[PDB]
């Protein structure tokens, strides 16, 4: 904190980002292939059965991706696109399968927030 | 204790209130306080003379002001260690008042222990009203004591009848002694006269003392007997 | 001599106000009797009056007869008597 010390490398610490999604490799989505599809127990104390999956991305690295919505159509080989969200209650899963695209179909009978899932406009 | 802003800024705080309309009516004191402002300047002021002696506080004796040789015959050619230290605390700390008379007083009561036994009233009568010519010792409002002697000594010193202080002191002492002897003779002869003309004193001083001792002795005796009994058991 | 100034205390007060009362007469008599019965065998008539005196003492109750307020002056005068510097 002396003037000399400041000159030879000292100052306020600066943080930009540590990247929330490192395996995604600085891009919005990556295509992947599901390996297995699980049902995870959440962290204490909120409880459910979370429909996560394991996905090998095109870049190579493997990732535990969450699957949102009520109903999920995902096998052991389905084409699936991954984005950089985070399932907060499940530890060690830092990704979401984006749901309109790929073999993952749009969530059925969705009325609210349709673009957040795959749901098309019902068209009367 | 921090210097309080809020004890002296009273009228300002009320003036603000009056301006606002928090106060509808002005206080009785408001105009008076405006007329006669507080000090509000709580400084440490420096002092340059000792008032009792008349010594100078602020000044420093220089090397050029001391040309002649010192004790042990060395000429001062440099400032010493104390002449470089910044003596500001002396300007601010209040002066110890010293008098030549205090030493004389101390001497007198050493020489005359039994003058202490003469009781002294310290409750002052009007100090401005008095007007003592110390040509003589016996002043009217003042009694005869060591103080009067000392005042006489000081007067002699001032007038330069005795240039030396000690001689003046001795002279004052000798003046005092004669007066004291006269006082002593007065009382005894007055007592004799009283005895002659059939005056009757119920309790003499020595008799009083004996009586006083007697009560104490009686108190002691009962206690002492109890203590002896306790010791036995 | 070496003066000893205390720090600022919460409350100047004697820790325990022992009163220091005199020992009981009946107990003393009993001790004396015990001492006598040490000597002179079990119950010889050298301690004939002592036993009677003990009995007289311990007739109504086992003991015959059945506080120091120094806190008030210390408590009162602590704040004065301190050499605590000004506020």
């Amino acid at each position: 904190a002396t003037l000399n010390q400041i000159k030879r490398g000292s100052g306020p610490p600066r943080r930009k980002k540590i990247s929330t999604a490192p395996q995604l490799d600085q891009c919005p989505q990556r295509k992947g292939v599901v390996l297995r599809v699980m049902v995870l127990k959440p962290k204490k104390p909120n409880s459910a059965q979370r429909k996560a999956c394991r996905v090998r991305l095109t870049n190579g690295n493997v990732v535990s991706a969450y699957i949102p919505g009520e109903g999920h159509d995902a096998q052991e080989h389905s084409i699936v696109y991954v984005r950089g969200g985070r399932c907060q209650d499940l530890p060690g899963v830092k990704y979401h399968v984006i749901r309109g695209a790929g073999d993952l179909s749009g969530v059925v009978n969705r009325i609210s927030s349709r673009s957040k899932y795959g749901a098309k406009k019902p068209s009367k | 204790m921090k210097i309080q802003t809020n004890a002296v800024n009273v009228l300002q705080r009320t003036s603000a209130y009056l301006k606002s309309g928090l106060l509808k009516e002005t206080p009785a004191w408001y105009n008076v306080v405006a007329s006669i402002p507080p000090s509000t300047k709580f400084t440490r002021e420096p002092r340059f003379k000792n008032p009792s002696n008349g010594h100078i506080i602020g000044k420093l004796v220089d090397v050029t002001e001391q040309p002649h040789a010192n004790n042990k015959g060395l000429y001062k050619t440099r400032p010493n260690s104390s002449d470089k230290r910044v003596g500001v605390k002396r300007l601010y700390r209040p002066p110890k008042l010293t008098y030549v008379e205090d030493r004389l007083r101390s001497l007198f009561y050493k020489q005359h222990p039994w003058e202490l036994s003469r009781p002294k009233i310290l409750v002052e009568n009007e100090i401005g009203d008095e007007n003592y010519d110390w040509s003589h010792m016996l002043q009217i409002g003042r009694p005869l004591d060591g103080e009067s002697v000392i005042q006489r000594t000081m007067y002699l010193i001032k007038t330069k009848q005795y240039g030396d202080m000690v001689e003046a002191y001795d002279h004052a002492r000798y003046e005092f002694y004669a007066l004291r002897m006269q006082e002593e003779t007065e009382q005894q002869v007055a007592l004799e006269e009283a005895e002659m003309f059939g005056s009757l004193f119920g309790v003499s001083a020595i008799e009083h003392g004996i009586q006083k001792e007697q009560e104490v002795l009686d108190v002691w005796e009962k206690k002492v007997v109890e203590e002896t009994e306790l010791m036995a058991a | 001599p070496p003066v000893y100034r205390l720090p600022p205390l919460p409350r100047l007060k004697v820790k325990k106000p022992i009163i220091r009362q005199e020992a009981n007469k009946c107990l003393v008599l009993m001790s004396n009797l015990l001492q006598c019965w040490s000597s002179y065998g079990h119950m010889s008539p050298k301690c004939a009056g002592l036993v009677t005196e003990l009995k007289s003492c311990t007739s109504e109750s086992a003991l015959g007869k059945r506080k120091s307020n120094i806190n008030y002056h210390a408590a009162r005068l602590y704040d004065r008597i301190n050499g605590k510097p000004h506020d």
Binding site: - | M1, I3, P27, A28, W29, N31, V32, V33, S35, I36, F42, T43, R44, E45, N50, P51, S52, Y92, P94, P95, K96, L97 | G83, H86
Partner: protein, 66 residues
């Protein structure tokens, strides 16, 4: 006659004349001027019809205060 040499609030330094007999002695010309100033303000509030309140918790002070 001020308090004592060891019981000195140095805030009051300007008022004191010197020390003597192990006692700070209050400058009395200063005392006089402050007294006059105080006396004048006392007179003023009495003239205006203000409520003057004399506060004196020490032992002997009561009668003179009343």
């Amino acid at each position: 006659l001020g308090q004592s040499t060891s019981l000195w609030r140095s805030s009051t330094q300007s008022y004191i004349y010197g020390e003597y007999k192990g006692i700070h002695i209050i400058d009395l010309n200063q005392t006089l001027s402050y007294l006059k100033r105080a006396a004048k303000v006392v007179e003023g509030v009495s003239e205006s019809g203000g409520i003057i309140l004399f506060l004196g918790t020490r032992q002997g002070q009561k009668r003179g205060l009343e």
